[PDB]
Amino acid sequence: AKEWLIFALGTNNWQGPGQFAPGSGILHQGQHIAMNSLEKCHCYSIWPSDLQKTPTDRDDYRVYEIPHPIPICEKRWHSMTDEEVTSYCDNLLKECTDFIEYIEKKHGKRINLFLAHHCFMNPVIMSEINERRVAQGIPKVPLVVFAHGTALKMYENEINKLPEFPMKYYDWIRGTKNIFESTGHVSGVFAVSAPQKNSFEKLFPLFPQERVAITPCGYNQLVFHRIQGMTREKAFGHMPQALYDGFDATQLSPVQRHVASDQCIPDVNAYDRVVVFCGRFAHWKRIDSVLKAASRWEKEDKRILTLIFGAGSQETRKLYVDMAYQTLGLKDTFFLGPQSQPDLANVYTVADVSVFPSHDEPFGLVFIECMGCGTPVIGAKSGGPLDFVNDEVGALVDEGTNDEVAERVYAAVKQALAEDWKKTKGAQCEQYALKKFSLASQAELMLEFVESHFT
- State the nearest-atom distance from the C-beta of 201 to ligand UPG, in Å: 19
Q: Phi/psi zone of residue 181: left (φ > 0), alpha (ψ -120 to 50 degrees), beta?
A: alpha
Q: In what order do the strands lie in the sheet with 353-355?
A: 333-337, 304-309, 273-278, 353-355, 377-380, 394-397
Q: Which does 278 bind (CB under 5 to 8 A by kind): ligand UPG, Ca ion, none?
A: ligand UPG
Three-state DSSP class for residue 186 = coil
- State the nearest-atom distance from the C-beta of 71 to ligand UPG, in Å: 17
**73 half-sphere exposure, CB direction, 13 A CA radius:** 23
Q: Phi, psi (5° rounding) for residue 219?
A: -120, 165
Q: Which does 109 bind (CB under 5 to 8 A by kind): ligand UPG, Ca ion, none?
A: Ca ion
Using the rule CB under 6 A, give the single segment among 20-28, 96-104, 298-306, 319-327 that binds ligand UPG: 20-28
Burial class (CB in 10 A: 0-12, 13-18, 19+), 71: buried
Distance CA 47, CA 125 (A): 13
* 347 touches ligand UPG (CB under 6 A): no
Strands (DSSP E) found in 105-169: 113-117, 143-147
Q: Which of 5, 8, 9, 26 binds ligand UPG (CB under 6 A)?
A: 26
Our CB check for Ca ion shows the closer of 151 and 368 to be 151
341 labelled ligand-binding: yes
Using the rule CB under 5 A, give the single segment among 64-72, 122-130, 152-160, 219-227 that binds Ca ion: 152-160
How crowded is residue 445: how many other Cβ atoms within 10 Å of its Cβ? Answer: 12
Taking residues 367 to 406 in sequence order and writing x for each that binds ligand UPG by CB under 6 A, - otherwise, the string is --x--------------x----------------------
Our CB check for ligand UPG shows the closer of 236 and 309 to be 309
Query: Among 44, 236, 23, which residue's Cα sits nearest to residue 150?
Result: 23
* 78 touches Ca ion (CB under 5 A): no
Q: Which does 349 bind (CB under 5 to 8 A by kind): Ca ion, ligand UPG, none?
A: none
Evaluated on CA atoms 439, 442, 448, 449, the torsion sign reads negative
* 144 touches Ca ion (CB under 5 A): no
Binding-site residue set for UDP-alpha-D-glucose: 15, 23, 280, 285, 339, 341, 361, 363-365, 369
Residues that bind ligand UPG (CB under 6 A): 15, 22-24, 26-27, 192, 278-280, 309-310, 338-339, 341, 344, 361-366, 369, 384
